[PDB]
Design an enzyme around this catalytic site. Structure first.
Site, PDB file in Angstrom:
ATOM      1  N   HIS A  79      -7.297 -10.424 -12.142  1.00 45.62           N
ATOM      2  CA  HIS A  79      -6.448  -9.736 -11.173  1.00 45.62           C
ATOM      3  C   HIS A  79      -5.014 -10.229 -11.303  1.00 45.62           C
ATOM      4  CE1 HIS A  79     -10.551  -9.435  -9.413  1.00 45.62           C
ATOM      5  NE2 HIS A  79     -10.144  -8.204  -9.153  1.00 45.62           N
ATOM      6  N   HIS A  83      -3.246  -6.559 -15.434  1.00 44.40           N
ATOM      7  CA  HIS A  83      -4.122  -5.576 -14.786  1.00 44.40           C
ATOM      8  C   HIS A  83      -3.272  -4.564 -14.030  1.00 44.40           C
ATOM      9  CE1 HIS A  83      -7.382  -3.820 -12.460  1.00 44.40           C
ATOM     10  NE2 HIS A  83      -6.935  -4.324 -11.322  1.00 44.40           N
ATOM     11  N   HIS A 117      -1.247  -2.831  -6.262  1.00 46.49           N
ATOM     12  CA  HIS A 117      -2.572  -2.837  -5.643  1.00 46.49           C
ATOM     13  C   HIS A 117      -3.379  -4.131  -5.565  1.00 46.49           C
ATOM     14  CE1 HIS A 117      -4.517  -2.717  -9.575  1.00 46.49           C
ATOM     15  NE2 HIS A 117      -5.675  -2.840  -8.952  1.00 46.49           N
ATOM     16  N   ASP A 118      -3.076  -5.115  -6.406  1.00 48.30           N
ATOM     17  CA  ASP A 118      -3.798  -6.397  -6.383  1.00 48.30           C
ATOM     18  C   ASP A 118      -2.814  -7.542  -6.181  1.00 48.30           C
ATOM     19  OD1 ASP A 118      -6.557  -6.024  -6.578  1.00 48.30           O
ATOM     20  OD2 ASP A 118      -6.475  -5.565  -8.722  1.00 48.30           O
ATOM     21  N   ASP A 228      -8.078   1.870 -11.357  1.00 46.63           N
ATOM     22  CA  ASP A 228      -8.451   0.467 -11.177  1.00 46.63           C
ATOM     23  C   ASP A 228      -9.515   0.017 -12.182  1.00 46.63           C
ATOM     24  OD1 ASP A 228      -8.276  -2.070  -9.948  1.00 46.63           O
ATOM     25  OD2 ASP A 228      -9.198  -1.373  -8.076  1.00 46.63           O
ATOM     26  N   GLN A 280     -23.845  -4.838 -16.473  1.00 45.15           N
ATOM     27  CA  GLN A 280     -22.791  -3.893 -16.807  1.00 45.15           C
ATOM     28  C   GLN A 280     -23.365  -2.487 -16.855  1.00 45.15           C
ATOM     29  OE1 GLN A 280     -19.056  -4.503 -17.674  1.00 45.15           O
ATOM     30  NE2 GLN A 280     -20.010  -5.600 -15.971  1.00 45.15           N
TER      31      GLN A 280
HETATM   32  N1  LIG Z   1     -19.497  -5.802 -12.774  1.00 46.40           N
HETATM   33  C1  LIG Z   1     -18.291  -5.267 -13.014  1.00 46.40           C
HETATM   34  N2  LIG Z   1     -17.384  -5.217 -12.051  1.00 46.40           N
HETATM   35  C2  LIG Z   1     -16.231  -4.645 -12.468  1.00 46.40           C
HETATM   36  C3  LIG Z   1     -15.923  -4.137 -13.710  1.00 46.40           C
HETATM   37  N3  LIG Z   1     -14.630  -3.627 -13.727  1.00 46.40           N
HETATM   38  C4  LIG Z   1     -14.186  -3.835 -12.518  1.00 46.40           C
HETATM   39  N4  LIG Z   1     -15.106  -4.452 -11.705  1.00 46.40           N
HETATM   40  C5  LIG Z   1     -14.939  -4.838 -10.311  1.00 46.40           C
HETATM   41  O1  LIG Z   1     -14.323  -3.770  -9.618  1.00 46.40           O
HETATM   42  C6  LIG Z   1     -13.234  -4.301  -8.831  1.00 46.40           C
HETATM   43  C7  LIG Z   1     -12.188  -3.261  -8.578  1.00 46.40           C
HETATM   44  O2  LIG Z   1     -11.277  -3.754  -7.607  1.00 46.40           O
HETATM   45  P1  LIG Z   1      -9.934  -4.504  -8.025  1.00 46.40           P
HETATM   46  O3  LIG Z   1      -9.878  -4.641  -9.503  1.00 46.40           O
HETATM   47  O4  LIG Z   1      -8.774  -3.686  -7.538  1.00 46.40           O
HETATM   48  O5  LIG Z   1      -9.918  -5.848  -7.385  1.00 46.40           O
HETATM   49  C8  LIG Z   1     -12.758  -5.491  -9.640  1.00 46.40           C
HETATM   50  O6  LIG Z   1     -12.035  -6.399  -8.813  1.00 46.40           O
HETATM   51  C9  LIG Z   1     -14.074  -6.092 -10.109  1.00 46.40           C
HETATM   52  O7  LIG Z   1     -14.636  -6.913  -9.104  1.00 46.40           O
HETATM   53  C10 LIG Z   1     -16.904  -4.194 -14.732  1.00 46.40           C
HETATM   54  O8  LIG Z   1     -16.827  -3.785 -15.897  1.00 46.40           O
HETATM   55  N5  LIG Z   1     -18.079  -4.795 -14.284  1.00 46.40           N
HETATM   56 MG   LIG Z   2      -8.241  -5.125  -5.751  1.00 47.78          MG
HETATM   57 ZN   LIG Z   3      -7.469  -3.877  -9.332  1.00 50.05          ZN
END
Ligand SMILES: Nc1nc2c(ncn2[C@@H]2O[C@H](COP(=O)(O)O)[C@@H](O)[C@H]2O)c(=O)[nH]1
Ligand SMILES: [Mg+2]
Ligand SMILES: [Zn+2]
EC number: 3.1.4.17
Length: 326
Positions: A79, A83, A117-118, A228, A280
């Site tokens: 994060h 990203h 966003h993060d 995202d 995954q």
């Molecule tokens: N298990 C898994 N979680 C993912 C993957 N890509 C994104 N995420 C999750 O989805 C969330 C999306 O929210 P953000 O990235 O804005 O925090 C990420 O923080 C992460 O926890 C992935 O390929 N596998």
């Molecule tokens: Mg986030």
């Molecule tokens: Zn994010």
């Protein structure tokens, strides 16, 4: 609270020019910003200008805003600033391919929302924060980090000479902050499940209406989810490298939980890496695939993201079958 960029940082950004070769590649969905780290800030300036116009924002203010936002992303494995720009580029590509469907106000707001966003992410999920009575979980009962990210966004805007939206009328100003607020909150994956089902239902019954503000909000919300998660829409080698970063944060959180006397879920357990491939597969089937499928239905031009996501799903299955490579 917020850190502030140096005069050398924003001044240097103003003189940046995007290399001609990249101008072509940046328009494509699969574009990976990875090998161009020094150019990330300049790439964002470029996307804003191409999508919203060179005079949309006062250049000085935009550059200070960008370099400060960068300075407020922490050096965490996933994060981070990288990203932030990755997500902004996906949004850029979606908007470029669906330009007239969105207002100038929305495009400005969404590109900025994606970059912020993060903001100030510490490396801990909402689960951790809530399950440990962190001050944030108390202030923000739901979508804890997302509310914090939005709060950070407004704080940066308030910094001297950083408010790129001040030239908007008093009405559009509040309108754009609401667009950004909803967009950032929508990145709370917890909200995605409900949003997607709703949109799917709306689309199939023929109820979906883009002139309906409540429907627009949902469509925009799915777009945010899509951007995202876009690392799953890149070429396989890129997707795989980012996955390692995602798990580095997950495992680090797991380690902290252990130290606090609480066993983490398998996904955040670095002693259970063997379960990653299957995990995954689940994430793609339960989150990624549905997201891009519904998005493609609503915005046909975004189909390349779905195709890419499916190709990567096939790669994870290939790993599980024991046919991986490199
Ligand atoms: N298990 C898994 N979680 C993912 C993957 N890509 C994104 N995420 C999750 O989805 C969330 C999306 O929210 P953000 O990235 O804005 O925090 C990420 O923080 C992460 O926890 C992935 O390929 N596998
Ligand atoms: Mg986030
Ligand atoms: Zn994010």
């Amino acid at each position: 609270h917020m850190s502030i960029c140096t005069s050398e940082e924003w001044q240097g950004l103003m003189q940046f020019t995007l290399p001609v070769r990249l101008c072509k590649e940046i328009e494509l969905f699969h574009f990976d910003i990875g090998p161009f780290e020094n150019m990330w800030p300049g790439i964002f300036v470029y996307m804003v200008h191409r999508s919203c116009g060179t005079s949309c924002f006062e250049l000085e203010k935009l550059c200070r805003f960008i370099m400060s936002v960068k300075k407020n992303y922490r050096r965490v494995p996933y994060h981070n600033w990288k990203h932030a720009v990755t997500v902004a580029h996906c949004m850029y590509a979606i908007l470029q391919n669906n330009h007239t469907l969105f207002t100038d106000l929305e495009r400005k707001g969404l590109l900025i929302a994606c970059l912020c966003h993060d903001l100030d992410h510490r490396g801990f999920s909402n689960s951790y924060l809530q399950k440990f009575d962190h001050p944030l979980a108390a202030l923000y009962s739901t979508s804890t980090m997302e509310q914090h990210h939005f709060s950070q966004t407004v704080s940066i805007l308030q910094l001297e000479g950083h408010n790129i939206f001040s030239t908007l009328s008093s009405s559009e100003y509040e309108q754009v902050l609401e667009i950004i607020r909803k967009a950032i909150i929508a990145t709370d994956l917890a909200l995605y499940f409900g949003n997607r089902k709703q949109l799917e239902e709306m689309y199939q019954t023929g109820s979906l209406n883009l002139n309906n503000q409540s429907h627009r909000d949902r469509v925009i919300g799915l777009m945010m989810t899509a951007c995202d998660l876009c690392s799953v829409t890149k070429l396989w080698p890129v997707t795989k490298l980012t996955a390692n970063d995602i798990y580095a944060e997950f495992w680090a959180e797991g380690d902290e939980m252990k130290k606090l006397g609480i066993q983490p879920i398998p996904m955040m357990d670095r002693d259970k890496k063997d379960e990653v491939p299957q995990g995954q597969l689940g994430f793609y089937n339960a989150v990624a695939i549905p997201c891009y499928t519904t998005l493609t239905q609503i915005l046909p031009p975004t189909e390349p993201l779905l195709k890419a996501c499916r190709d990567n799903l096939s790669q994870w299955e290939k790993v599980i079958r024991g046919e991986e490579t490199a």
